[PDB]
Amino acid sequence: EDTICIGYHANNSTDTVDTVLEKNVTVTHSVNLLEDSHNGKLCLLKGIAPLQLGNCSVAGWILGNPECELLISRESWSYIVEKPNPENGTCYPGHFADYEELREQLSS
Amino acid sequence: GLFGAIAGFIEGGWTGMVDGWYGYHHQNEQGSGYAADQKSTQNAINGITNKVNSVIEKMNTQFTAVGKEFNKLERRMENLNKKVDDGFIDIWTYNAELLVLLENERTLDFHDSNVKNLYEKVKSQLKNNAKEIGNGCFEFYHKCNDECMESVKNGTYDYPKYSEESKLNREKI
Amino acid sequence: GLFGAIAGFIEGGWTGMVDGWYGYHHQNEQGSGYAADQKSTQNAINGITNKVNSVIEKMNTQFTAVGKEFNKLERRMENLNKKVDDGFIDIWTYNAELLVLLENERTLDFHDSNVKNLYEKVKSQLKNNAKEIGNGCFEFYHKCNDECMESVKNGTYDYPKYSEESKLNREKI
Amino acid sequence: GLFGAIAGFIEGGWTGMVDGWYGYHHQNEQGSGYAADQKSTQNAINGITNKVNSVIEKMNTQFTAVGKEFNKLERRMENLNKKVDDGFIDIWTYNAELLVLLENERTLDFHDSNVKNLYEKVKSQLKNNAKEIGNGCFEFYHKCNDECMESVKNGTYDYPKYSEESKLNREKI
Amino acid sequence: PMDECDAKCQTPQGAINSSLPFQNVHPVTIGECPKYVRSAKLRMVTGLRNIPS
Ligand SMILES: *[C@@H]1O[C@H](CO)[C@@H](O[C@@H]2O[C@H](CO)[C@@H](O[C@@H]3O[C@H](CO)[C@@H](O)[C@H](O)[C@@H]3O)[C@H](O)[C@H]2NC(C)=O)[C@H](O)[C@H]1NC(C)=O
Ligand SMILES: *[C@@H]1O[C@H](CO)[C@@H](O[C@@H]2O[C@H](CO)[C@@H](O)[C@H](O)[C@H]2NC(C)=O)[C@H](O)[C@H]1NC(C)=O
Ligand SMILES: *[C@@H]1O[C@H](CO)[C@@H](O[C@@H]2O[C@H](CO)[C@@H](O)[C@H](O)[C@H]2NC(C)=O)[C@H](O)[C@H]1NC(C)=O
């Protein structure tokens, strides 16, 4: 005869979520909470651009090593960018004292 | 599951119901069709929305430079920093994963809730004017045109209007 | 809510009932009145009490001086300290707020539980000697003076003592 | 408890049933006996197992030397280290204990779930061919030899095969 | 490579979208960053158990 049924939504989604009691539970809707992608670019932070040193370490840049872009134009920055092994640092050998501190304080 | 409706007596879902999460399937002569109950579906969307926006929007994060660089006579400091970083990473990893697990279980149980409560809502309207056929389905004793169905959907059903015919058709069964 | 009793089929609450959280309203000739079911109410007070006293009393805190003062060649140390403080504050803020949310939901669901279970307790005692009128209410077929009501309240009801009169009054309905 | 089956209408447990967590007791002439429903029991073992293995297996811990030793002009550093250690210990103690509490409650509620859902599974098969005697027990109107019982256990019951006899035995009751 | 994009979280390999609470890209960051975790998958269900047929 006549009928009224009560049921629930379903679709083609294959999203799986882990659960306390059961794992790989296929669900209709889901949301990611875990960022796992980077844009492979050194963007600028909160409106301020980083300081580019190109080929020099902080020591070379601030001492005025003859081969470093002194970047007189730069009046503010958010963070500093070196390379793994900068090429032009203390061109006349010697020890730079309290170097980690200075790097820390010139960071921004 | 935890309430025995989803994956319980209601064996599966309706791929044909796109109007929302919770709904109805009727079978009056005039024809069939699927509908959604926008009250319960909407309350569920608001609740789940608030949950997710509560796991996300609650993360305050100051401006922070995680990195610290030390020399060769500052190994104690370097290992202390390392100890801080690694400690926080352990905490957030553990609490984050268990949070996701527990609240996923909670969400599924919450949907199961809404469906069972809906089934009971319909049942409390049809006490003797219908029987519990199969699962998530009632068979009427009186014929219920579209008007009557849409009446069950919006809560108003009008029982004594159909009580007599039902009283007849039920006796021989 | 999650069980469909509070804000569900029971539309609202009884401002006149001060004896506790859960209770009864009877309507025998002798007169009306509100009462509370001290068993379930007391179990709920013990449970909730234990919850709150478990969110508070579980906070061990050693004697600690959060402040550290550094000079101008200790910026690495100063930022490390800052990093520790800010990290803990982030953790405790997040976990505290989500804890309050989740357990508030759990508490409301717990009350909804207690009320539904109470309704069912009454229903399983009155199977055919009464009908489910309206919501959170039963109408008797046999008249039930104060003594009988107070019997339903303390669990003992004595069904076959009233089964015959009920069998009569029910037929014509 | 939260669903009113364990410590609810089912007053206690069956010390004689060793086949599992959930099961049956039948009383057909041929004789009595206890059995377990391995479907629900096994699903519960898988779920709980996954829970515990989720609270344990989720603890990543790097190789770490907690101890740091300082001299007499490094009290700021020593109190900083002390502050880190003490902070983490506070966090893990609090979160660990509340986790155990909350998840114990959740587990007990989960068992209560499984039992109530099982009771309802049996009820939905025997609508008019039986009555709800006592608690966690049904009395048949037609006599149900071992084969029939083992039918209720594996889901298949075959109702219209026994509907007539029941229709007879029920009228005078 | 350096670029004109703007972000609120920076990490050696490249900037991050800082709207979600957790990440797994790189531990050592600079900015208003998500928290680093040793997790492959942190996915929360908003819908219900999908059982088509
Ligand atoms: C900035 O960095 C560049 C790259 O390192 C420096 O130029 C390089 O200087 C080294 C000496 O330390 C040169 O290596 C030597 O070359 C001679 C032959 O010229 C060879 O016989 C030695 O055995 C040794 O390998 C290297 O060729 C040279 N590279 C270039 C491209 O010039 C430069 O001196 C640095 N600038 C400052 C201011 O420090
Ligand atoms: C940084 O220094 C490197 C040197 O290692 C420069 O690389 C040279 O670039 C020129 C032309 O750009 C090439 O002809 C050379 O062969 C490169 N040298 C090597 C060793 O590969 C690089 O150009 C410098 N970058 C800046 C911005 O000054
Ligand atoms: C940064 O992350 C947020 C959240 O992960 C992204 O917002 C999502 O956008 C997609 C498509 O517009 C939606 O399907 C999601 O539901 C959104 N999530 C939330 C939480 O609102 C945002 O698009 C990301 N930004 C960039 C530039 O990638």
Tab-separated table of N, CA and C in Angstrom, chain B residues 119 126-134 137-141 173, chain D residues 127:
chain	number	residue	atom	x	y	z
B	119	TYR	N	13.265	8.917	12.584
B	119	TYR	CA	12.416	7.729	12.540
B	119	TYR	C	11.408	7.741	13.683
B	126	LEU	N	2.120	7.951	13.994
B	126	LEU	CA	1.400	6.966	13.196
B	126	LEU	C	1.058	5.723	14.010
B	127	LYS	N	1.034	5.846	15.337
B	127	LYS	CA	1.003	4.718	16.262
B	127	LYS	C	0.273	3.494	15.712
B	128	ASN	N	-1.050	3.574	15.547
B	128	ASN	CA	-1.820	2.441	15.043
B	128	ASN	C	-2.217	2.573	13.577
B	129	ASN	N	-2.037	3.741	12.958
B	129	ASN	CA	-2.417	3.916	11.560
B	129	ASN	C	-1.380	3.371	10.586
B	130	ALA	N	-0.389	2.622	11.064
B	130	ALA	CA	0.636	2.071	10.191
B	130	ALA	C	1.388	0.991	10.954
B	131	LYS	N	2.124	0.172	10.207
B	131	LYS	CA	2.964	-0.868	10.777
B	131	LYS	C	4.404	-0.660	10.330
B	132	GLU	N	5.335	-1.194	11.119
B	132	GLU	CA	6.761	-1.064	10.829
B	132	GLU	C	7.157	-2.180	9.874
B	133	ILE	N	7.111	-1.878	8.580
B	133	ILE	CA	7.541	-2.818	7.554
B	133	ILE	C	9.040	-2.662	7.381
B	134	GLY	N	9.708	-3.766	7.060
B	134	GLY	CA	11.120	-3.720	6.747
B	134	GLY	C	11.893	-2.815	7.680
B	137	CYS	N	10.909	2.263	7.144
B	137	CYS	CA	9.756	2.308	6.259
B	137	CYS	C	8.510	1.917	7.036
B	138	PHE	N	7.422	2.636	6.779
B	138	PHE	CA	6.119	2.347	7.355
B	138	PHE	C	5.127	2.100	6.228
B	139	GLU	N	4.227	1.140	6.423
B	139	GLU	CA	3.122	0.913	5.500
B	139	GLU	C	1.836	1.419	6.129
B	140	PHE	N	1.101	2.228	5.378
B	140	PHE	CA	-0.151	2.779	5.857
B	140	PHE	C	-1.287	1.778	5.706
B	141	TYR	N	-2.284	1.931	6.569
B	141	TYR	CA	-3.551	1.231	6.436
B	141	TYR	C	-4.563	2.043	5.643
B	173	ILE	N	-5.746	-8.021	9.323
B	173	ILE	CA	-4.314	-8.293	9.284
B	173	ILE	C	-3.909	-9.132	10.493
D	127	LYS	N	7.926	-9.240	16.416
D	127	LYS	CA	6.953	-8.210	16.768
D	127	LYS	C	5.749	-8.753	17.533
